[PDB]
């Protein structure tokens, strides 16, 4: 009584509603320290004339 487990399971079934169906989520957070930026984009090159 008044002493419960803080966690509870999800009811993920194939027949469950879209709202209740599982969804995988990735959050991309970017950081800028007093350090070199080591994660850069492609910046693709062109032809030579």
């Amino acid at each position: 009584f008044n002493c419960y487990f803080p966690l509870q399971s999800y009811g993920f079934q194939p027949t469950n509603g879209v709202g209740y169906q599982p969804y995988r989520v990735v959050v991309l957070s970017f950081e800028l320290l007093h350090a070199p930026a080591t994660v850069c984009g492609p910046k693709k090159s062109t032809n030579l004339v």
Partner: nanobody, 126 residues
Framework: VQLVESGGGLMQAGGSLRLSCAVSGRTFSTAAMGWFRQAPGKEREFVAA????????YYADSVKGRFTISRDKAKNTVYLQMNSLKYEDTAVYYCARTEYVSYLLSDYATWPYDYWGQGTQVTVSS
């Protein structure tokens, strides 16, 4: 995944028996283990449950003060210490396992479990 029960058998009233139930095979997680019993011609009935995390226990009224459920995580084994045995305790005892985590321990009394052992006979004599 298999639940392998052992212990029990014949004991005179007033005595004590210990049941074991070992979980074999690859498990992702265990939420709780339980003991149930079925006496001849009667419905299968909840006895005791234990949360794998923390080891909090929940008991049927009929076994309070007499039976103790316990767990050894490292051995993936649940135990039922059956003290002060009465004729009413004669039954096939079944181990059960679930991965379902409820915030509410009492839910393990009524939750349909996913995995079941083969059952172990306990017979209490005069």
């Amino acid at each position: 995944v298999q639940l392998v029960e052992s212990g029990g058998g014949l004991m005179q009233a007033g005595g004590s028996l210990r049941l074991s139930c070992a979980v074999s095979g690859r498990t992702f997680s265990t939420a709780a283990m339980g003991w149930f019993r079925q006496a001849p011609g009667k419905e299968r009935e909840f006895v005791a449950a234990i949360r794998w995390s923390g080891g909090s226990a929940y008991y049927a009224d009929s076994v309070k003060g007499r039976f103790t459920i316990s767990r050894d995580k490292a051995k993936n084994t649940v135990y039922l210490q059956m003290n002060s045995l009465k004729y009413e305790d004669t039954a096939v005892y079944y181990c059960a396992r679930t991965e379902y985590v409820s915030y509410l321990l009492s839910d393990y009394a009524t939750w349909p479990y996913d995995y079941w052992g083969q059952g172990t006979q306990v017979t209490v004599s005069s």
